[model samples]
Target chain A: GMGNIYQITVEEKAEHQRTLSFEFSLHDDLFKLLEKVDGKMDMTPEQTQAFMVGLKLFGEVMMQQRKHPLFKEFSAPFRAFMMNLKKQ
Target chain B: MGNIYQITVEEKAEHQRTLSFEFSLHDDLFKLLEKVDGKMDMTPEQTQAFMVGLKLFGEVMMQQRKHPLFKEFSAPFRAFMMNLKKQ
Candidate 1:
């Protein structure tokens, strides 16, 4: 019942695009840890790691939700891309 | 007070590799896993894997919200999180 509450609204400018918003009750304070790891991993490495991990996690969940018609068209391309990602 | 996790991922392909590393996690992954257990149809093991990977990634995304590198992904990622929280 007690956690950090975050609400974000994302608006896309493309035609037919609609605003999407969401909220989360995170158990830990991410900004606080951000300060803790300030000088830890060298600059670029940490940034790269963040990018890679976030995409992988997003992709994994996308794959799991592939059965949903909203994501049907992208699953194959995503799967192929992930394969190429690991090979490199 | 600290939340560091030691992880070892073993690859059994032709060329084997063992990755043993430790990283600080903001939340208790087990409890998060437990909370989402039945909500999603994932197996217990699948839930564990998802919880671990997502939290690690989520923390980074949260901290880097203003980074231009993740500009295109922010909305979709938030949408996914909402979907996951929905039954």
Candidate 2:
């Protein structure tokens, strides 16, 4: 009830097949956001959903992990990206 | 320098508009690129973008299957992805 629960599975067959599973909780109404942003960037409904979900999922991680070295120089551009997205 | 991407949208009236930006994400996007193995019939760049986008959204949709907004969306999205993969 706190947030929706998600489970993800990644499988690959290579020299040796491997799989990964991840489960987490997310609080956003992702579908609603997808619908609102649809066609904004010339994307179809499916593309829109992917962009919205990826942005939120990745962006939320960056926000919490802002202190990480990986995101060190990303703050400015990410902010700008958001601003530009808002303008579109 | 972070990964830089330039998006150019084609216009129906001709000509195109473009935006270029740098972005960073911690995901192993290259690994995802390998996983897809051209199944989507997309160029490497297109594949990367689609895989990243779909995986991100799909995870959320899978989580909230009971939500009203996704009531009619689940099947269509899956079909779309399957179609892309087959192409």
Candidate 3:
């Protein structure tokens, strides 16, 4: 097993929308890098660290990501993540 | 030459004294995006739409002298553009 590079688990209980939780896992190393841009979370700092990095890196990386002819390879993850955001 | 963006001060980092930048205005000088998630999911089109605006805005800002942020960030930003990633 490659082990999970990053994992997002959505727990949306039918009755309580607010109870929904999105757990994102992205190893442990990148978590520290989140601090590079001053990103923090409420609890489980490691989990939060991954989230922060995944997020801030979007802006930092996207500036350069769009230019190349083969940029789609890198953008898949962002598209996947964004696609999951829509709900009925 | 046009409207680029607006910045918002969301919350100051509690211990680090870091400022949370909601958005950055870069005609080529612009900037974030977390806030967008809460309200709605933005597709690639939504995201790309803003970049065009930012690039145009950056182009215009580079040409202006009276503005403050232009005066403040342009010199360093131009230097940054020189090296630019690994291109």
Reference-based lDDT, each prediction: 0.50, 0.48, 0.33
| iRMSD (1 decimal) for each model | 14.3, 16.8, 15.0
Model 3: DockQ against the native?
A: 0.03
Residue-wise lDDT of candidate 2 within A25-74, one digit each (tens)? 34554444555677776544544544565665556555555675445455
Span of ten consecutive residues with least summed lDDT in model 1 chain A: A6-15
Candidate 2 stretches with Cα past 4 Å from truth are A1-4, A11-19, B1-87
Q: Which candidate achieves the best lDDT against the true structure? A: 1
TM-scores, in order shown?
A: 0.54, 0.43, 0.23
lDDT of 3: 0.33
Best by DockQ: 2
At residue B20, what lDDT does model 3 achieve? 21
Q: Compose the digit string of candidate 3's lDDT tens values, residues A1-88.
A: 1111322222222223221112222223332344543422222443333334334333333544465432344455445533442220
Question: Considering only N, C-alpha and C atoms within 3 Å, which residue pairs clash in candidate 3?
Answer: B1-B60, B24-B31, B25-B30, B26-B29, B26-B30, B27-B57, B27-B58, B28-B58
Query: What fraction of the true interface contacts does model 2 reproduce?
Result: 0.13
What TM-score is obtained for chain B in each of the predicted models?
0.75, 0.52, 0.32
DockQ rank order? 2, 1, 3
lDDT of 2 by residue, B1-87 (tens): 222222212112213221122223334444656767666433444344345544555654565566545555556556655654544
